[PDB]
Structure formats: C-alpha cells, structure tokens
Design a protein around this nucleic acid. Structure first.
Ligand SMILES: [Mg+2]
Ligand SMILES: [Mg+2]
Ligand SMILES: [Mg+2]
Ligand SMILES: [Mg+2]
Ligand SMILES: [Mg+2]
Ligand SMILES: [Mg+2]
Ligand SMILES: [Mg+2]
Ligand SMILES: [Mg+2]
Ligand SMILES: [Mg+2]
Ligand SMILES: [Mg+2]
Ligand SMILES: [Mg+2]
Ligand SMILES: [Mg+2]
Ligand SMILES: [Mg+2]
Ligand SMILES: [Mg+2]
Ligand SMILES: [Mg+2]
Ligand SMILES: [Mg+2]
Ligand SMILES: [Mg+2]
Ligand SMILES: [Mg+2]
Ligand SMILES: [Mg+2]
Ligand SMILES: [Mg+2]
Ligand SMILES: [Mg+2]
Ligand SMILES: [Mg+2]
Ligand SMILES: [Zn+2]
Lengths: 91, 50, 114, 99, 69
RNA sequence: AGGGCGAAGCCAGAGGAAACUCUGGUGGAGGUCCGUAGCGGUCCUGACGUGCAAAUCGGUCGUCCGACCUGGGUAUAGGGG
RNA sequence: CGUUGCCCUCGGCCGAUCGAAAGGGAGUCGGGUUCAGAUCCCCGAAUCCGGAGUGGCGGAGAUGGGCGCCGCGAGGCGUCCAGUGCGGUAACGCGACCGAUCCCGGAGAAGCCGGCGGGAGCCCCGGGGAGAGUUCUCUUUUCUUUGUGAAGGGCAGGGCGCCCUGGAAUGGGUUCGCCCCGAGAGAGGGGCCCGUGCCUUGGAAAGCGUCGCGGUUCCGGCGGCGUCCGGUGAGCUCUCGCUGGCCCUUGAAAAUCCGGGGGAGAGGGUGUAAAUCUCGCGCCGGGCCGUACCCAUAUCCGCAGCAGGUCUCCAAGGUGAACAGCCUCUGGCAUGUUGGAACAAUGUAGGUAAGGGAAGUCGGCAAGCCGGAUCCGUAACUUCGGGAUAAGGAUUGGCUCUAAGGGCUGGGUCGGUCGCGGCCGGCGCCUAGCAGCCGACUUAGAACUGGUGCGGACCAGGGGAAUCCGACUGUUUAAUUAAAACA
C-alpha cells in the first residue's frame, strides 16, 4: 500500500463506476494482466493475448484457456472427470 | 475538374464552340430577323447541362 | 525556409503518397516519392517469429527482377524455412521412423509368439 | 603561416582623390588584434606602402574582409563611398574602383 | 553509369559495336574517359596525365573522341 | 499543440522475529483535468433584424484519445426509411 | 519446325460481370525551355515490362581422372569411365547453376497509444570566403549567399527472437521503463537485413554567387575567380527501428510476385548437348483517355465578386510551456462594392470614473475581481480514488557575482633492438585517479540597484456555505427549448 490504500489496479478508473463495480473489477483486472507460468517450458510468460487465448512468448504455445484466467475451475473439473471416465471405459 | 472523362471533354468542346457570336454578314442576308446570338452562355452565370 | 509541394495530383498523405526530402544539384529541396518497405519472408514452420536470413527483403513484385541467389539460401528448405526448424524436422522425421520400425519389430515378435 | 593581403588603390590615387600615406596611417591606427586597436597587437601584423598598393602581412590568423570593412570605414570618413567601390580583384587582394 | 578500373577494360568497352562518343574530361588531377554505350556510360579515371595522353592515341577506328571543354 | 494530476508494475533504503509496513525514486494508467486546431453552440435574451446571411457576426462559452472529428464509396424510400 | 484437324491423357473450385483519380498495384530522375505546357517539350543520365524465332554475342553447364602407347621433356594419339556448379564447423556465401502436373509456404497483408534510439530537412552557434547595408560616435559589423537527382559500387550507422566456442549462485547481464539466462547468461569470435547517411561513378561539362568582357542589334554569347571548415541539441518536421500498454474492440480482400517439397521427364556421348526462376552484355516495342487555370473574404455551392459553407500537403526568427497571443523575414496584399468635409443628438464597439458598494434588477444580467510561475499552506465531506489551482499566504524586474550539475583524449615512461613509428622484455600500473581539450543548458544562493516597479504588453480560474435534479463521460429539437429530457 505504497501509493494507494485500497484501489491498486482499479485506481485508473478514478471515482467512476461505483465502489462495488470497481472492487469487482479488481479481481479480474489483476488476473487477466497476470503473467502465468508456461507449463511447456516453465518460464513465467503465459500472457493473455485476447479473451480465452493465452500465449507463451518463449514457448510460442498459444493456449485456449479462460476469459480472465489461464484456467477456469470448470475446465479443470471437466478435465479430471473426462480422464476418470476414459480410464473407466478402456480399463 | 482536371480529371475529365473523354465523354465529358467532348461535350465541353461543343459547348465551347457554340458560344461564339453571330457573323455580321448574316445580318445582311435577305430575310434576316436575327440581330444577336441570344444563346450565349457565360461561365460565371448559368452552369451547363451538368 | 523553402517550403514545398507534392509532385503528383495525390494531395492526401497516404500509404501511397510517402516522400522524402532531397537536395538536387540545382540547389533546391525537392520531394522524391519513396518506395514501400519490403519484408523478408517469415518461416514455413510458423512458430519462429523471426523473419528469414539471406533473403533480400523487397516488395514482392520485385522478386521477379532479382537473381535466384538473393531470393533463397543454399539448404534443403532454403529461404522457405528457418534452419532450426529444418534440423528439428530432420531429426524428428528420423527419430519417428526409428520408433515406427521398433513398433514394427515388436508387432512381428508378437505374431511369431502367438 | 604568412597571411599576405594586398589592398591596391591604383586609380583613385592617380586621379588624386585620396592619399595612400594617410590610409596606411589610418590602418596602422585601427586594425585591431585580439581586441586591442593600437600598436598592431605588438609586432604581429605589418603594413606596407608602395605608392598605390597597400599590403598587410600577418603571422596570426587574420581575416581578409576585415580590410574591406576598414577601407569602407575609411572611405566613408573621407566621403568617398559614393564614387569609390571596393572589390576583390583576386584572392589575397581588394581593389578600389569607380562605378 | 559505371566506373572502370583497368585501362584494358575501357579499351575493350570502347571497341564494341554499340559504342560511340568517347569524350575526355581533363579535370586537372584526374583526366576521365567517358565512353557512352547503348545501356551505360562507362567512365575511367586515369590519374596520370602522360598516361592519359598515351591512351588518347590508342582509341581505334575513328570514334568521336569528342574532347570536352 | 503545450501543460496538470500521477493508477498498476519496478528499484533502493529503513523497520519488522514473521506478516508485511513505511520513506525516497522510477513508471506513465485514464470514455482523467486545464487548453490549442478540430468539433460544437451556453449567456449577453449583445450585433444584425427590407441583414453579409431565407439563421449570419462579436465576445463569452462546452468539448478536445473517445460512445472523438472528418473526405470518398456503399446500404436503407414515403404509412416507407 | 511451325500451324491446325481428329483420337487418347489430365484438370476441383466457386462464379459471368461491375465496384476505389485517398485501399492494393512493376517501372523516372537532374538541368534547361514558354506570353500560357512541362517528372509529359530539349539536353543528359536512368529504368521496368513484353518480345528476341533462325537464337545477336560472350560466360556458366565443362571440359577432369584413368589406363595404354609414342616423345629427352612440354606434350601427341588409342582406348576406358566420371561430369544437371562450388565454398564454409555453422549462421550462411559465391555471377549463372535442368526440370512438368502436384503439393506447402511466404510476400501483397494490417488497430490505436506510449517511451526510447538512429537517419535526414529546417533552426542554432563558431569561424573561412563573395557581394551588402551601417559608419555623427561605436561596431574584425550586421544582412544575403555559400550545391549535387535517380540507378549502381564501396563504406559508416542502425537492427537481429542467427551461428560457433563455452559453461554462469558470491548469481550475472542490462533498459529512461524493462527485459534475458542450463530451453545456454556474461566473454570472445563470426553470419544476415536495412543502409533514405557519407565517398564515388553520375559530375562540373551542368546549377548557383560574384567580378569581367563580346554584341547599335540578333544573341540562351563567352571568360575569370568561388562554391570552405568545424560544433551543437527533451530543438521542431518526416522517417527507419526497438520496445512496452489497451481491448467482452484483436484492427480488409483480391489481382499480382516469389521461395521451398517433390522428382514425371529432357540432354550429349568425351567435345559437345539439352539447360540457364541467366550472369554479363546486344536488338525491337509500349497503344488508348486525362494533363490549361481557379481551388476561395472574386473562377465551386448558397439567385450575386454574399462576413455562410466546402477534403488535404508544405510550414522560417523573437518572446514563451506552447502550432497561445504579440512583433518580425521569405512570399503576399491594398483594408474587403467608393471618396471628400465636419465631429451634433440618438446609437454599435471600446475605455475611465470621487464617496458608497448590489441600496439596481424577476434575478449580480452586464462588467469587475481572480489569473502565469516558484515557495509555503490546504477544510468539510468521501465510493479512500478524490475534493484540490480547495481556501489562505509570500515572492517575481534590472544589474554584478557564486555554487551545483557533462563529454572527449592522454601513462604500457626503463632497457633492447627494428624502421617521430613499430616489435620484444622488464618495471609502472593514476586501479582514491590526475592532466589537457571541448560543449549545451538549467536550478539554487548572494551583493548592489530603481519614485515598491517587476507574470509591467501579450497570455491568464473570482472564491466560499448550502439545498433540488440527474451518478458520471456521451446524446438531443439544422432555424426560439441543452435540460432535470434520451443514452
Ligand atoms: Mg457560381
Ligand atoms: Mg492508390
Ligand atoms: Mg543468399
Ligand atoms: Mg438578440
Ligand atoms: Mg434597423
Ligand atoms: Mg460588406
Ligand atoms: Mg473493376
Ligand atoms: Mg553472450
Ligand atoms: Mg496543372
Ligand atoms: Mg491557397
Ligand atoms: Mg477600415
Ligand atoms: Mg479603399
Ligand atoms: Mg470584397
Ligand atoms: Mg465609482
Ligand atoms: Mg428596488
Ligand atoms: Mg434588492
Ligand atoms: Mg456574467
Ligand atoms: Mg469545494
Ligand atoms: Mg432533503
Ligand atoms: Mg447528466
Ligand atoms: Mg434548436
Ligand atoms: Mg440554444
Ligand atoms: Zn523455426
């Protein structure tokens, strides 16, 4: 809290849009601009390019992910289920 | 305009030829009722078939 | 100061109407119109973002004029594809075929066993 | 180096309009060196007399057209800038002439 | 245009069918030899004066040799 | 045009047992502020009101990186757009 | 060998066609020339595209190696094979280097915004010249002017997400910001791209500046001299480049052009061939239409030479934050459809007013106050971001000084030997650096000074407390309603 007590990323917006909305945006607004780790090389370069598409700059691995996160929870839970059923079918 | 079609350029040419005033020997013809051209078009007032 | 005019009937400053200043032997600054900037070809691999070496990056309808040597490079996949992606293609294509052979061998042993 | 600038005034003197000795004297007075008017900055520049032709001979860096200035100044003082005109005859030289 | 570096080479270029005027510019300290052809205006810089005077004679059948002033 | 404010990220220093916090920088966000061209058109209920003008003029004003301004091309036609 | 007829063989497309004088789209520039046209005429330098058959010529393909003889030897013949180019560890290179249908790829072909860097044009400064103006006094003066097209070749200067060596924690490298590294950092060596910058061919012959002649004339006449050297930068304009930021916005197609994978074919048989996405040269051609001028306080539209409207490019000095205003050069005008003489009332547009200070009026409408900068100082309230230039204060000129901020280059001196310079060996090793040489510009402080004047013109917020409405930015009745209406 060097410059701001409690706005951070959403200090750009100034007074506008209301407190709740700006608090609500701060979560996403952070995550979406986060640089994640490319589970492919392991550098911290997974960066959202456009909605649902994240690109490693080093790996050059474009990756269909979430709108504001490299992974949605939904996607993750769906992944594991499919893996479980796959194993249940084939044996 | 300085970017003319050929169609338009030719049109202008004829218009430019039509402007000239009567030849004065016409006045001396036998059954002459014509004293002046009366179809004379000045560019600054009256602005073409366009 | 010598101000100046465009030399063509294109008034608007556009992609087509780009210029540069030049002093003539007559000692008057004059506009010369400039040719667009050509790009080197990018790789056929499609991951390597960097454009290709040893090729004259020039506006494509020029290539016509150019000699063959300018337009490419002495390698397999020359001036179409970056080296790195060739020497990975090479050893990939080799190593793959060695495993295909190994699976063929494991298949043939399984037939002889059964 | 040796910077040798003539300043010949042939046919204003032959017509008797000015005197070259007085012009020399005026030049020895004025010709400034390093922002000092008198004494030619010591024994640095040297002014010569040959009836009509003046020669200025410097060792230090010395502009040519400073002689044009001072002739123009001298000609104004004598009310000659009207029918007398300084010109570069050649390099290392000026030349007083009529119109 | 094209500069040339060998006195022989300019002599060969001058000896072509397409060639014509072989004008000669004494610049002082230089003495060029400009020989026009179909496509290009070949020039050759010959720093020596006596060597230029010698070459002057060595142009062949009755070309223009239109010396420049 | 040119200025202002100075958001995230980054550096150092100091404290803190940790959590982390302070101080100084850097950084340059924004349907952010001033303010030109631009776009507009508040008030003077000013000028004009057989006008310069069948809606103009002057000062004063709003906005000026964005639901911005704007040329050309192209689409939608009358109980229709 | 062409040309055609027939037979077989192969062939996806994708919609005929139209649609841009600003999108895409090969290739032209310098000088001259007119009463009026010039990238179009003339001179000179280029260039693309198409053709080029019989192939016009060189060069490449390609002229090796073997064995057998004969010859002192250089070599000559006989006969056997090879020959669709070579260099580099590599990035990749070299003037050419066969090849079809088919396939893959690229180029054409990409938003806005910020920051930083390089290159030019212009500005600036210090000097050289040539011509000027000033000269009562002063002024080594102030003013002008001081050049090199495209296309080639060279070389700086940029950039590289290219390669090789090698192996980095005491982690390093490094940007204004970042950002990069065992998926290979630093360090060394290279490779490629752009090269609009220099040099050079062009090209001094041409241009410009000066002095000077030839000619009653006509005359594009002819000569001299010159066209120099340096330095600066949050400078501005354009541009090339790198690197970030923003998006529930992700920012054109196609014609055209190339590369690669393939390997169906073709070539001649030991001096030659087919082959040149041909290398260098040579020859021939490029039709059609537009091209005057105005482009706007007089060539356009508003009935007009109408204060209206109407899309762009270029863009000097001073002051200054500044494309603000004010004054200036370059260039341009004659005050906007008239003149003269008066200076009454009413006006329109500006100003100023003693004492009071909104008593005026529906209402502070109108005008006035405030205004820049630096330094302090900053409330309630709050969505904690703001409010905020809150408010409220002080300073500001001229002059003469001081202090503080940067770059470049330099020691390998002693001894030896070789030609002030090199090479070797030994000291030295400024390793707290010191010395000389350059150059913008700011900031702070101090003295003195003036009739307290100083952001001296220009530019340039009046504040405060509360209530009502609408969250906000946005939009709206062209021509009486900008709002609380719509969004
Ligand atoms: Mg009209
Ligand atoms: Mg175009
Ligand atoms: Mg190459
Ligand atoms: Mg009114
Ligand atoms: Mg009236
Ligand atoms: Mg009027
Ligand atoms: Mg069409
Ligand atoms: Mg390295
Ligand atoms: Mg014209
Ligand atoms: Mg104009
Ligand atoms: Mg007037
Ligand atoms: Mg008048
Ligand atoms: Mg008028
Ligand atoms: Mg009063
Ligand atoms: Mg009353
Ligand atoms: Mg009252
Ligand atoms: Mg008011
Ligand atoms: Mg307040
Ligand atoms: Mg209430
Ligand atoms: Mg509102
Ligand atoms: Mg209205
Ligand atoms: Mg209104
Ligand atoms: Zn690659």
């Amino acid at each position: 809290a060097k410059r701001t007590k409690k706005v951070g990323i959403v200090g750009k917006y100034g007074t506008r849009y209301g407190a709740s909305l700006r608090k609500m945006v701060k979560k996403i607004e952070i995550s979406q601009h986060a640089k994640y780790t490319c589970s492919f090389c392991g550098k911290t370069k997974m960066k959202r390019r456009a909605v649902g598409i994240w690109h490693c700059g080093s790996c050059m691995k474009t990756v269909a992910g979430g709108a504001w996160t490299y992974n949605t929870t939904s996607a993750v839970t769906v992944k594991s289920a499919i893996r479980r059923l796959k194993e249940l079918k084939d044996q | 305009s300085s970017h003319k079609t050929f169609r338009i350029k030719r049109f202008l040419a004829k218009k430019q030829k039509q402007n000239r005033p009567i030849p004065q020997w016409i006045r001396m013809k036998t059954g002459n009722k014509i004293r002046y051209n009366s179809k004379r078009r000045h560019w600054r007032r009256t602005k073409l078939g366009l | 100061v010598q101000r100046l005019t465009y030399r063509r009937r294109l008034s608007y400053n556009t992609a087509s109407n780009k210029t540069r200043l030049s002093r003539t032997p007559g000692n008057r600054i004059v506009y010369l119109y400039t040719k667009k900037v050509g790009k080197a070809p990018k790789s056929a691999c499609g991951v390597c973002p960097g454009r290709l070496r040893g090729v004259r990056a020039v506006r494509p309808k020029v290539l016509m004029r150019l000699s063959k040597t300018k337009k490419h490079v002495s390698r397999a996949y020359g001036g179409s594809m970056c080296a790195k992606c060739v020497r990975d293609r090479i050893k990939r294509a080799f190593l793959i075929e060695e495993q295909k052979i190994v699976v063929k061998v494991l298949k043939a042993q399984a037939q002889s066993q059964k | 180096q040796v910077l040798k600038f003539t300043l010949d005034c042939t046919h204003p003197v032959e017509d008797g309009i000015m005197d070259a000795a007085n012009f020399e004297q005026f030049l020895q007075e004025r010709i400034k060196v390093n922002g000092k008017a008198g004494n030619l900055g010591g024994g640095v520049v040297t002014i010569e007399r040959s009836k009509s032709k003046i020669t200025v001979t410097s060792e230090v860096p010395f502009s040519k057209r400073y002689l044009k200035y001072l002739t123009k100044k001298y000609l104004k003082k004598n009310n000659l800038r009207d029918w007398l005109r300084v010109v570069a005859n050649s390099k290392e030289s000026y030349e007083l002439r009529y119109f | 245009p094209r500069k040339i570096e060998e006195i022989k080479d300019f002599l060969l270029t001058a000896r072509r069918k397409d060639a014509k005027s072989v004008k000669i510019k004494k610049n002082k300290d230089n003495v060029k030899f400009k020989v026009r052809c179909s496509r290009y205006l070949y020039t050759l810089v010959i720093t020596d004066k006596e060597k230029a005077e010698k070459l002057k004679q060595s142009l062949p059948p009755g070309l223009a040799v239109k010396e420049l002033k």
